[PDB]
Amino acid sequence: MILVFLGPPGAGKGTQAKRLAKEKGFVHISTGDILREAVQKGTPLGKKAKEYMERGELVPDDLIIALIEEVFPKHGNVIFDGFPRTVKQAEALDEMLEKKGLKVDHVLLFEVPDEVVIERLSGRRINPETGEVYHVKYNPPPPGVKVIQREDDKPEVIKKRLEVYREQTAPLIEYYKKKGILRIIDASKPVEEVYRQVLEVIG
Ligand SMILES: Nc1ncnc2c1ncn2[C@@H]1O[C@H](COP(=O)(O)OP(=O)(O)O)[C@@H](O)[C@H]1O
Ligand SMILES: Nc1ncnc2c1ncn2[C@@H]1O[C@H](COP(=O)(O)OP(=O)(O)O)[C@@H](O)[C@H]1O
């Protein structure tokens, strides 16, 4: 089974993907996590990607397409989490999968309003060593766990990221709808309820 998780930043895509991957044995491919590792390592990809990420812009498509070609799991279940982010990326994914006799089985759209997104992102904190994600209100880290706020989770960058999502990423809703594989999630609900909805789709 191949899944794509699609929706605004802060919808809870990563949170749900990590849980589904561990509980059911999917390989979790998060372009954001992979990009952050590249930036930390100072690879050619990381060095180039860094300034786009800092500004809240998308990293250029060709970089992302190459990355996915490089890390694509050839067998087994996969969750693409925050990829594709543009129509060109989605077209490239379809072509990759078709060469392998595969297809995207379900695209889960995590629907959530802007006000909720902004609260989710503003309160997001991460363990920079493990990538584990917390929220100051809805899931605070326990004692002993050092967290930071992502620089792109500051107010002005959130604003930019939501604009970018609406312009470049939201068209994927229609792209996948017209393949007949889109499934809608209410990602504004609490974390357990969102997970129930995810399970309902894949079952
Ligand atoms: N259903 C939810 N209700 C409240 N907070 C949530 C929910 N899902 C995730 N969170 C929190 O909201 C923020 C965004 O979640 P995250 O999984 O990073 O989203 P995405 O991967 O879609 O950007 C994090 O701070 C996370 O702890
Ligand atoms: N598929 C992608 N295409 C282009 N840029 C990406 C992609 N995935 C992640 N990024 C870059 O990484 C940044 C953070 O993305 P991500 O880690 O998915 O965080 P969030 O869950 O808050 O959207 C994006 O704003 C963009 O700069």
User: How many distinct structural domains can be found in the chain?
Assistant: 1
Q: Any catalytic annotation for residue 196?
A: no
Exactly one of 13, 18, 36, 125 is catalytic; which is it?
Answer: 13
At a CB cut-off of 8 Å and minimum separation 6, what does 126 contact? 132, 133, 134, 147, 148, 149, 150
At a CB cut-off of 8 Å and minimum separation 6, what does 145 contact? 127, 132, 134
Range of the domain at 92: 1-203
At a CB cut-off of 8 Å and minimum separation 6, what does 183 contact? 106, 107, 108, 109, 201
Chain breaks in the chain (C to N over 2.5 A) after: none
- For residue 28, the surrounding DSSP H or E stretch is strand 27-30
Can you say which residues are annotated as belonging to the binding site for ATP?
A: 10-15, 120, 124, 133-134, 189
CA of 11 to the centre of ligand 1 (A): 6
Query: Helix, strand, coil proportions of the chain in percent (round to 5)?
Result: 50, 15, 35
**Pocket-forming residues, ligand 1, beta carbon under 6 Å:** 9-15, 120, 123-124, 133-135, 138-139, 190-191, 194
- For residue 21, the surrounding DSSP H or E stretch is helix 13-24
The token duo for 100 is 């392998």
CB atoms closer than 10 angstroms to residue 70? 9
The residue to mutate among 3, 6, 109, 120, having the most atoms of ligand 1 within 8 angstroms of its beta carbon, is 120
At a CB cut-off of 8 Å and minimum separation 6, what does 7 contact? 13, 109, 110, 111, 112, 185, 187
Which atom of ligand 2 has the smallest separation from the CA of 82?
A: 18
Ligand 2 proximity of 34 Cβ (cutoff 6 Å): no
Cβ pair 14, 67 in contact under 8 A: no
| Solving technique | X-ray
Cβ pair 164, 158 in contact under 8 A: no
Q: Any catalytic annotation for residue 19?
A: no
List 106's β-bridge partners, or say none. Answer: 3
CA dihedral 22, 26, 27, 28 (to 10 degrees): -70
Question: What CATH number is attached to the domain comprising 123?
Answer: 3.40.50.300
Can you say which residues are annotated as belonging to the binding site?
A: 10-15, 31, 57-59, 82-85, 89, 120, 124, 133-134, 161, 189
The residue to mutate among 135, 145, 153, 195, having the most atoms of ligand 1 within 8 angstroms of its beta carbon, is 135
Which atom of ligand 1 has the smallest separation from the CA of 110?
A: 22
| Closest C-alpha to ligand 2, atom 9 | 32
Sign of CA dihedral 157, 187, 77, 181: negative
